[PDB]
From Swiss-Prot:
Name of protein: Mitogen-activated protein kinase 14
InterPro entries, alphabetized: Kinase-like_dom_sf, MAP_kinase, MAP_kinase_CS, MAPK14, MAPK_p38-like, Prot_kinase_dom, Protein_kinase_ATP_BS
EC number(s) from the headed UniProt entry: 2.7.11.24
Broad class of enzyme this protein falls into: transferase
Residues recorded with modification N6-acetyllysine: 58, 157
SUPFAM superfamilies xref list: Protein kinase-like (PK-like) (SSF56112)
Activity regulation (record text): Activated by cell stresses such as DNA damage, heat shock, osmotic shock, anisomycin and sodium arsenite, as well as pro-inflammatory stimuli such as bacterial lipopolysaccharide (LPS) and interleukin-1. Activation occurs through dual phosphorylation of Thr-185 and Tyr-187 by either of two dual specificity kinases, MAP2K3/MKK3 or MAP2K6/MKK6, and potentially also MAP2K4/MKK4, as well as by TAB1-mediated autophosphorylation.
Residues with N-acetylserine modification: 7
Gene: MAPK14
Function comment: Serine/threonine kinase which acts as an essential component of the MAP kinase signal transduction pathway. MAPK14 is one of the four p38 MAPKs which play an important role in the cascades of cellular responses evoked by extracellular stimuli such as pro-inflammatory cytokines or physical stress leading to direct activation of transcription factors. Accordingly, p38 MAPKs phosphorylate a broad range of proteins and it has been estimated that they may have approximately 200 to 300 substrates each. (Microbial infection) Activated by phosphorylation by M.tuberculosis EsxA in T-cells leading to inhibition of IFN-gamma production; phosphorylation is apparent within 15 minutes and is inhibited by kinase-specific inhibitors SB203580 and siRNA.
Record's comment describing the protein's domains: The TXY motif contains the threonine and tyrosine residues whose phosphorylation activates the MAP kinases.
Length: 359
């Protein structure tokens, strides 16, 4: 009760070559195999001899490279420490082999190993309607939680959804610091899921950007193809309007772009398509839910919690089992700091980390 620990031992670490580099981890982790071929960060599967479960370990090897990297590192760590939900990626551990700040460089993060992203799942499976309900249900259950903390994902796409062989899903990698990307081969899966608001910088937008992404993802799960596979920003917009209909005078007045308003008006007008014609052989409740998600007006789009109560998720929905997050204090965002300043704050977050209890 009033007994206190008067000191603490650092775990022993060991070193090894992985992905052509030096991974140096506590002897708590064993059998680290690379996963995902760079696609994620550097992420190795491993065995956590403490919790006795397979884990994933990610190495940030460029976190304090610049003021922009350094703040992003602190951001991602504060977010990941905060997220404590069944459908959101959070942390089993975070460590560094630095014995002090003067030695601090690499940060490693540890979470439960899932074994796939949703892209991989869709690639080897036509998913049944039941698998669609359950996967979409979990996306929405995670987003209800994230949104209740005033956080928005902003990307949300299948490569940001980790899934295991029990069809359990967690949301990874929020949309301001989210691996290495830009444009390397094709267009990759990067623009296809994005809300139009934010694609063309329309308003200050709201959280229902992520619901647009959910609709796009759900559409793909159902049909097996990308809903709006645009070739560039403008094409993507055309493909979107072809389905949802060109926005009306009132919705246009609600946006502050001079460019978008004038662009969209040169475009031949189109009425909303019949969604039962596009989403064939699907549960009609599935279709009705798409109609509430794939709306252009942010103010008229379904919320994460509103969608959870939609008759599509009757088997899974349970208002008592859809937790909300503690308030998340993002004060640090309004600071203009140097490197060795974001770096000490981050070092303070690593060493003050408290692991979840066993069980």
């Amino acid at each position: 009760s009033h007994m206190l620990e008067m000191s603490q031992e650092r775990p022993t670490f060991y070193r090894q070559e992985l992905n052509k580099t030096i991974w140096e981890v506590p002897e708590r982790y064993q059998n680290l195999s690379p996963v995902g071929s760079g696609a994620y960060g550097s992420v190795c599967a491993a065995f956590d001899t403490k919790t006795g479960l397979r884990v994933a370990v990610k190495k940030l090897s460029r976190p304090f490279q610049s003021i922009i990297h350094a703040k992003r590192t602190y951001r991602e760590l504060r977010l990941l420490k905060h997220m404590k939900h069944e459908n959101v990626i959070g942390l089993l551990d975070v460590f560094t082999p630095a014995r002090s700040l003067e030695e601090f460089n690499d940060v490693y993060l540890v979470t439960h190993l899932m074994g796939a992203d949703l892209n991989n799942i869709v690639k080897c499976q036509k998913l049944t309607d039941d698998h669609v309900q359950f996967l979409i249900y979990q996306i929405l259950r995670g987003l209800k939680y994230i949104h209740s903390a005033d956080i928005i994902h902003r990307d949300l796409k299948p490569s940001n959804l980790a899934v295991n062989e029990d069809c359990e899903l967690k949301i990874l990698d929020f949309g301001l610091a989210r691996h290495t990307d830009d444009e390397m081969t094709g267009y990759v899966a990067t623009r296809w899921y994005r809300a139009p608001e934010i694609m063309l910088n329309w308003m200050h937008y709201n959280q229902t950007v992520d619901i647009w992404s959910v609709g796009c993802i759900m559409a793909e799960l159902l049909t097996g193809r990308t809903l709006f596979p645009g070739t560039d920003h403008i094409d993507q917009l055309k493909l979107i309007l072809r389905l949802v209909g060109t926005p009306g005078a009132e919705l246009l007045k609600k946006i502050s772009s001079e460019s978008a308003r004038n662009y969209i008006q040169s475009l031949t007008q189109m009425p909303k398509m019949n969604f039962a014609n596009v989403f064939i052989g699907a549960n009609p409740l599935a279709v009705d839910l798409l109609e509430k998600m794939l709306v252009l007006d942010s103010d008229k789009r379904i919320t994460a919690a509103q969608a959870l109560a939609h008759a599509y998720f009757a088997q899974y929905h349970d208002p008592d089992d859809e937790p909300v997050a503690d308030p998340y204090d993002q004060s640090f965002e309004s600071r203009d700091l140097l490197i060795d300043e974001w770096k000490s704050l981050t070092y303070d977050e690593v060493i003050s980390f408290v692991p979840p209890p066993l069980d």
